[PDB]
Structure formats: C-alpha cells, structure tokens
Amino acid sequence: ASPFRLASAGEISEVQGILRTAGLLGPEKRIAYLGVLDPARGAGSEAEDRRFRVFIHDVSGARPQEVTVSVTNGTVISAVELDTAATGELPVLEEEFEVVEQLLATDERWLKALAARNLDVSKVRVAPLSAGVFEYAEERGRRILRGLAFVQDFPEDSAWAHPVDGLVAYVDVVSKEVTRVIDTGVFPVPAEHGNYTDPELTGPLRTTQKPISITQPEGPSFTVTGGNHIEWEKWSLDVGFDVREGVVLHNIAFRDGDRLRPIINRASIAEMVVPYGDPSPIRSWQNYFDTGEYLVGQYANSLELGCDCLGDITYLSPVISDAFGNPREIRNGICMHEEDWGILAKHSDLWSGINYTRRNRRMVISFFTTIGNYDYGFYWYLYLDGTIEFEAKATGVVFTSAFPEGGSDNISQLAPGLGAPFHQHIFSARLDMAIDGFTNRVEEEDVVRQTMGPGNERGNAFSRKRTVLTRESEAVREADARTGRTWIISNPESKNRLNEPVGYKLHAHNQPTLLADPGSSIARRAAFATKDLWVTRYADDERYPTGDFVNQHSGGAGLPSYIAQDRDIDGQDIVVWHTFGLTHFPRVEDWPIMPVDTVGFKLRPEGFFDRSPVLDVPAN
Amino acid sequence: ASPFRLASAGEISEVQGILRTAGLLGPEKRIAYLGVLDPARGAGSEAEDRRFRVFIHDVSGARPQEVTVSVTNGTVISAVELDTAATGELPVLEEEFEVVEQLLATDERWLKALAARNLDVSKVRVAPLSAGVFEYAEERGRRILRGLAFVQDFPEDSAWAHPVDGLVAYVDVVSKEVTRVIDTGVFPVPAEHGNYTDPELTGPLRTTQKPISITQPEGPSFTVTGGNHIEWEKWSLDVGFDVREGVVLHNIAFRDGDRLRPIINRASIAEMVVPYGDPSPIRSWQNYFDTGEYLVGQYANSLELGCDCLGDITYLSPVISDAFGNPREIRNGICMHEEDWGILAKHSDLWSGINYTRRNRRMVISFFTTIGNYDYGFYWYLYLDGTIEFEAKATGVVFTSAFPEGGSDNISQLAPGLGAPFHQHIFSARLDMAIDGFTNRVEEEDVVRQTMGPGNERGNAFSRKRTVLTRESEAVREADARTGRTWIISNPESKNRLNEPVGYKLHAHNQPTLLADPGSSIARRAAFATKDLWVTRYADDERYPTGDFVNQHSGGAGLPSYIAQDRDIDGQDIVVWHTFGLTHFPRVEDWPIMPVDTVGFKLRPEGFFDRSPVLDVPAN
Ligand SMILES: [Cu+2]
Ligand SMILES: [Cu+2]
C-alpha cells in the first residue's frame, strides 16, 4: 500500500515484459541499472504510480537508452538515446568483468609480457577496473576497461599476494580489441602467499574465547509492517534498497507526544570514490567510483546469522534485476536489530538523595558489499536520544603492487617485495533534509575566542558565531576542527518553547578531503570530494554528486554544475551533501586480510525538543 | 606477591599505625591524599617494598606535611613541611564542603542577601567550589572555598533548577570565617522544577522496550589472578586504583607467540579541568580541576549489576583511606567485562571462492565518579587487534545560572529564565610508553600533498612526512586535522620482519583545546590544556601535568617547568601527555538531566606486528 515499499519480483518481471513488448529488450540489450523512482514532491499525492528508471546497454554497439516505465499502467513513459561521448558511459556490467581476462589471454603482446616473466597464462587473473578519462583520444565514446594482473598459484590461492607490476592493458569491451599493452619493466612477483585460512599461516586457532549469548527473550522492540516500514522507540521510517546506492532511508521521523515530526526525507550514500596516490603509470589512472561506476547494491552479501549479524535479527531480502530483466533476490541482504548501548544518563544527587541511571539503545540497519578485493559495511544507527549516525566499515584485502628496491614515497611495504599504494576511501552522504517540514536552512557554527579586557577582565570568556548560508554560491564549505566547526540545519518557521528555531547539528570527523592536485582528472570528476559540505536546493533530477553517468565522464558533472545555479537555500527545500573519508597508508597489520577501520558522521538534536526526549525511558 | 597489587585494608591500617607511632597523626591531623607509590625503575629492586605517599592537613592551621612511609618496614622514609603560599594547598577535604553552607547560614551579609530575594535560608543549598588564584590578596596561604546558592523547594527537589544568581561568598574553611559576600543584584530565581523522576514531567513511562539479555554460559574469557592481574586474548595488564587519578593501567603487554611484548608501562588520566566561559563576576573564577583539587577516585560510585554494568561482570572493590586513616572500601567500584564488537575482518573472494568472516570483541575496564552536579564515566578498551582506546562519558546535571533579560553571548537558555554557562571539559592522558621496551621516540606524521608536474604528470600522488621530536623543547605539538596529523611512538632498536622500527600510532579526536585568553589565570594554571601533545623524559617526580599541589596554586609547576630541562627524548624512556576535551554549549536537550556525550583517543599498532595479529581467531 505504501509508495515507498521495496520493489517486488513481480514488479521487475512486469517491467521486463513491458520493455520486451516495446522492442527495447532484444538479444543485444542489457539492463545496466534498474530501480524504482521516488514519488515527486506532493503532500496530496495519493494515486499509486510505481515508476522505474532503466539504463539499457547495447552489446552490438548501438547507442544506449534511458527509459522510464510505469509498472502501474504498463506503459513506457519516455525513452531517450544517450550520446555517451557527451554525458558519460553507463555503469559497468558484471558480465564485462570476465571478458577482460579472456581477451588478454589470446593477445600476443600480453602473452609475450607473461612469457618474459615465466608466468603460466592459465594462472594469471586480471582485475578489470574502470578507465577514467586521461590523454587517450581514441577512448572517447568507447567503453574501456583497464586490467592489472595477479598470479593465482592454485584455485584456492589469494591472488592479491602476487601482483605483476610493470604491466597494464586497456580493453574495448564492446569491439573486443586490446587497444594498448604497456610494459614498463620486469618486477619480481612477490612469492609469499596470503592465505589467511592456511593453518601454516594462522598457527593453532585460539581456544580461549568463550561464547557471548545475546538473546531477546520477548522478541525485539521494533515492528516491521508493509515489508519495510519500521517503528522503534518513537522513530518511524521506511527502509529502501536501490541497486546503485544500496540501503536508502526514507521518511525518518520522530513522534514527539502526539505529533509525528519529520527529520530527514531521504538519506543515502550517493557516491563513494577510492583514489590511488601512486604516480607509477601502471596505476596513476586508478580511481574506483564504487557507487557510480560499479553499483554497490548489486554486490551485497547474504549475511549469516551469528557470524555477520549477532542477536535477534530481522532480515530484509531485497529484489534486484539481472542484466536481462529477471528478478534476483539477495537473500538476507539487510540486517535489522537493536543493541544495548551502555549508559544513557546518570546522576547521583547529594542534596535530593535520588540515584538515577538509565541505559541507551540503538537501532541498527546494515548491509555489506564486496567489490573485488574490498569489502564495505554500511551502518545506519538510530539512538533513543534522537541522534542519527552513519558508519562505514572498511575491510577485505588491500590492493597490492611490487615494493621497489630502494623504497617509495607513495607505497607501503607489507611483506618481502610486496607493496600497497597509498589511497583514500571517500564517501558522499546525500541528506534530503525535512526538519519539522521542508522549510529549512543551514548555519555554520564556529567557536569564538575573546580577548581579555573590558567586559572580559579575567580572560575566561568564549562564545560562538553562526552564519546563515543563503545562496548555493556560498554553500560550499570546508571543515575547521581547530574552531570546532559544525553545521546546524534549522526550520526558521518551527520554534521550540523558548521561541528558538528547531534544529539538528551535524558533527563531522574532520578527516582530510581529496589530496590529488586540483588540476588533475580525479579532482575534476570527483569535485564533491574536495570540500566537506555542500548545500543545494532540492531538484528531483539532482540525485548523485557525480552526475547520472560517472563512467568515463570528462568531469564537472554533479555538484559543481548544480551549485552553479546559485539558488536560494534560506528557508527552502534543501539537500545536504557531506564528504567524509579515510586516508589509508597501509600498515603491516592490514596484511593478509585487513581488520576493520571506520569513518562516519552523526546528527544530534539542537533545540529540536523542548527538553530531553528520553525522560520516559523506564529503569528496568 | 605482585608489587602492583591493589592497596589492602591492612596496608592502609598499617600506614595509620606507622604515622601515629611517629607522632604525625594526632587528633588535629587529617589525611588529604594517600596513595601507593609505583616501583622505581629497576628490574630487581627491593624484592618488594610497598611505599605510600601521604599529604597530611592540620585543622589548627599549622603547616601541612608530605610524608612517605614503607608499610613493609614500618618506617617513615621522609616527612617535609609544606609552604602552601609557595607550592600550593592540599586537595579539598570532604569535611570542608559541609562547612560552607553552615557558616553562611549565620552570616549577616548572606542572610541580608537572601532576605532581599524573599528566600528562606533553610531551603538554600550552597555548592562549595574550588577557589583558584585571582586578585584577592588575603587568600594567599589560606584554604578558601567559594559558594554559589541554589533553592531546594522540598527535600527531593533538584536544586540545580533554581540558581540564585547575582550572589557569591568566599569562605576560609580553616578559621571558619566568611571573608567576602558579593551581591551584584537580584535576579529572578527560575521557578520550573527539574525533577526527572516526577511523573508530571516524564509522562507515562514507555512500555515498548523489550529486554536484551547478555549472558556468558561458560563465563568470561578473561582471568583475574593476584586480585587485579588480567589476562585476556593475548593482552596482559594490572588494574590499579589511586584516590586522585582513579583507575590506572600498569604493564600493558601483548603476548606475540612466545614473547610478552610491552606496550605501555603506565596509563592514567592525570588531570582534568572544567573551565567556565561566562564573564559574570559571579562565575568568572569557576574552574574545576576534578583530578588535582577534588580527587576523582574519592567519589567513585558503587556500580549496580544489570543497571550500570550489563552482562557477565567481574567487580573490583578498591580500598582508600578516609581523612583519619581508616580504610574505606568502594564496593563494586570497578566493572570489568568483555563485549562483542561487531565484525573484525571479512572478505568474499571471487577468485578463490573462499568466504571469510570473523567477529571482534573488546575488554572494558570502567568506573564512574560524581562531583556535585557532574557525573563522569572513565572507560578503557582493549581490542583483539591490538587497539587501545580511552573514552570519557559526561552526564549528570548541567551547571545553571539565570538567563539574563535580553540574552547572552556566553550562556544558553534551557527553560524560562534558566541559563547554562558555556564551558569545556578537558582531560590529560599521561602515557608512560614502553613500546617493546623503554627505548622510544615520537614522530609527528603529516600528509604531504604533491603538485602536478615532472614525476607526477597526472597530479594524483600524495605522500607523508615524519619528523622526529628529539628534545623536549620541540615536543610541544598541536593538532592539524586538515593534514591528517598523527603521532607515532616507535622503538628504534626493535625492528619488525621488514627491518622497520615497531610502533604505535596515536589518533586524536582533534577537538578544540583551552579557549581562555593566554594571559588568564586558568591558562597559566592549566597550561597543559593549551596544546594537544607534550613529550617529556621520564622522571619519578613528574607525575601530574599541573604538579602535585593544584588547589589555589598559581602557575610555575607542571608540564612547562618540566619541558624547560630540554632533555633528550630520541630513543629514551619517555612519557606522552595528550590533551583532549569537550567544548559544551548546552542545549535544551541537556535539561533536566544530560544524555551522555563522549570524547577520547585511541592507539593502533603501526608495524608493531609482522602481519595481522588476529589470524588465529576462530569462526565461532
Ligand atoms: Cu584502504
Ligand atoms: Cu558540560
């Protein structure tokens, strides 16, 4: 019944039949993206119209199309041919990955480079990686992948332990031509294995860990209705899933007494870029846009009870489409549970003799994805006190290279002859704000130091200042940890009982932003990553910080072009885009499989409530 | 047996007996501090000689004494008379707090001030606060407390809801004389109650929270031997307790195969300061040195099972001395338990076909203290992967004032007429490092951005730089979040298998440091708080960043005096002092009782191990 329900297998099958009958899904077509569209802005929108947006690829070389379908009326709403040399290529297809290694295996330059290094071609795995846009004019308008080679000594071997440095190949996966094979010189292939389930490497397994039993004897405190609507501890929201973005949170609201108060209309991680900082021509082109180029939702793991998710777990199994329009279920792809979160508030008062302690809890919504060697966990948290928090967890296997004799300023050594180039993992959170409604504004809050003198005779005073961001041209902001800079999203028309506008405060981790030179290709295509905070006026077609078609787009798409419109954002329908990330200089302890490292952000109420919202939590 | 065992009741009783026999603890004497001394540097030393340090106050006004005794030999080792006008007053005694309200209730100036406000003296509570050093010459060499008043409407009322602004009194607690009563004018006393257990303010309690049960059917995975020696998942340490610093960690080591490897010799929170930034003369003197002036261990709570500490809890009950030398047990004052901590490492490999998931856990050592309106939790965490983390949790009731008509730049409004002055909560971590032994050094690590051009033709490279701190004069460092700055403590004489010095990396939160003007009294007394990192050469008498006697002591002791020795710290026995804090602009949601906010730091291995140290964790 809800317009925000998860897509069903039936809806996807109905989309496939509609496209096929319209002549848009023949043998030479592939679906590169399929997803449901959000309802348009309308507080009276009640007529059910489930629409899907589809990117259709053509393997014979015809121009691709963007199609919008109504599953409701069974009609094609629009269909436009795309000029990819202008607006960018479609996302990478899972079936194009295997093609790279197959084509190189019969290419004579590739075989000769392998022969010089005495490598069996049957043992050489190729990582197929996105191409980017650099100085090669012949790749414009063509779908290119670039390949790096790794040796797999046997079928169960971890190939990441054995990079083949000095070698890279470019492949046109449409015409199936190897365009270039570049051999910069022979490097020894590192010999130690990295097999983290080999008893030879692990040693005897620990027998010292005792079980921790987390049970909910009366079931969980949250309810799920209509498939994906959660109610928990005065929170209300809908859990969506998109094949590009992954888990998406809709309609986050909080019941304050007898009022359901909106906070966030839509929350998602709308891009994620992994730029490498090794100047070697073998890797200086390497930049993953995991969300925009690869689609992180389509690689979500099925999550195992007790291993991946511990406690009383409620699962969602979302449906996506395969490349032919068949529905595919990601069984146990989203975990939902609550967990204890320690002390919430505590005071023992000498004067009143009252001793008071209450415990905190958080609601957790999570999924995990695997893109090649990397694995990323996406965690959304809701706390009793109104805090909302996101956390990314990075693990998997680091990407490797040779470690050069004489060292490197841009690569860490992990094992004899084995290196790991420096890189970053940078996320963009898109937060379509709705603090008590859609009339919102953003203020930047800095700490203000004061000088000893008149009115500050003892030199103890300090203060704070707030600056309203009024237009998009002034709403590109950077962090300043030294002055405790935060950002407040308020509703100037909804006041608390002290007649102050209600608000929420964004707390960033203040990690470094994109380190690449400003003139570089990655700084142009990942412009969002150069600044900590962006604010735009809402528009329904401004969805991703990097534009709709990220793969092999020349740059400038997404946020820099949106911001150029210089729209009013002072008491308007606005969207907050927060950049945050990890700068990873790999350490020996990250090898051969990396312990989790985390980064995130959180939002806390700032005069949104008239007093603490957890006074009604029982002692238990 | 172990020289780091907790002080026993018998030892404290013996100190009492020894001081009495020596004529140092007659009826007019009071114990203001009593603590066990750590063994001096020496592998062998005195078989065991348990020594105790005592500060002895005299209630007839005679000069106090610092005394060291050996409980083993039954002897006084040294006893020195203190000139408190020069070196500082002793910490505040618990029995002195009660003096203040009782003395004011008979003072004609105080009664006249309350009569002017139509207040009944029998309902006026006085918060007795540390005095600091300002422009009052008659206070030099006297023990002074300052009092701020709050109305309690009935015996169970929260007095913090009803501050009596415009009024402050100064009291000599030894001669029992009210030195000054200052009245800057009548403010309305805020009328709303702040009683967070009153059903009329909480409303009906929630019935929606279902139980979370956390059990360990085979018991915990750690062992406790010798009363306070912990072994847990390759970690080894001794948990100490001191009445000034609270929980102290000794001898933190990690068993790496055959070898027990030292990491940290002694870890403590060695000072904490809470400065207020309201320039009103009623409060511009307000700064708490909770550790140095009040002794935070003295006010440790007894922690309730299932409420304060949830799960399979092992308790320690430390023993301290009262003001007369009798042992007092802080029952269930320390909780110790292990917690599940989500995913440790995870990878699904396409090429090998192996799926791999491991879970993380942490060991938690915690205590809570209550000082007036404030409650602080101190948590130390040890993780499976070698990470060490500290977290402070701040809750309780915010300190209040009137909210002036027309507003304030230095005070938040919480309720009609009720204000909360801006303030900070700043901690100093003293980390006596011992990375694989005592030969250590600190490097400051910054990210290095690189310009596009020769050798970096695509503008993607970035790097890092490390700067060795070689002398104490250059070891006073500030954060730089923009350049990702961290600090590495390494042992230049212990190399990993890649022939690199083993190390640990300090990750700060990069919160603002002390905001007060550099010429202010608080900036001089809390000089440690103005910089993020200090490194000193180890010395037995350099224990606290503010010095031994903080109460009513001007600047001239502590970290700035230590650093002036300019000693060699490059490959020596060194101590890291890390400043970190919260800057608190109170919000409406902090009233009437504050939900927990947090700050901390962590240390992670950086080439300390030869590979990941958690390959031998089993799959459950
Ligand atoms: Cu990484
Ligand atoms: Cu505070």
From Swiss-Prot, chains A, B:
Topaquinone (TPQ) is generated by copper-dependent autoxidation of a specific tyrosyl residue. Disulfide bonds join C309-C335. It comes from the Bacteria. Induction: By phenethylamine. It catalyses: a primary methyl amine + O2 + H2O = an aldehyde + H2O2 + NH4(+); 2-phenylethylamine + O2 + H2O = 2-phenylacetaldehyde + H2O2 + NH4(+). The keyword Metal-binding applies. Cu cation binds at H423, H425, H584. Keywords: Copper, Disulfide bond, Metal-binding, Oxidoreductase, TPQ. InterPro entries: AGAO-like_N2, Cu_Am_Ox_Cu-bd, Cu_Am_ox_TPQ-bd, Cu_amine_oxidase, Cu_amine_oxidase_C, Cu_amine_oxidase_C_sf, Cu_amine_oxidase_N-reg. GO terms for biological process: amine metabolic process. Its cofactor is Cu cation; L-topaquinone. Substrate binds at residues 288-299, 371-376. The active site is at D290 (proton acceptor), Y374 (schiff-base intermediate with substrate). Its EC number is 1.4.3.21. The keyword Metal-binding applies. Binds 1 copper ion per subunit. Catalyzes the oxidative deamination of phenylethylamine to phenylacetaldehyde with the concomitant production of hydrogen peroxide and ammonia. Homodimer. Belongs to the copper/topaquinone oxidase family. This is Phenylethylamine oxidase.
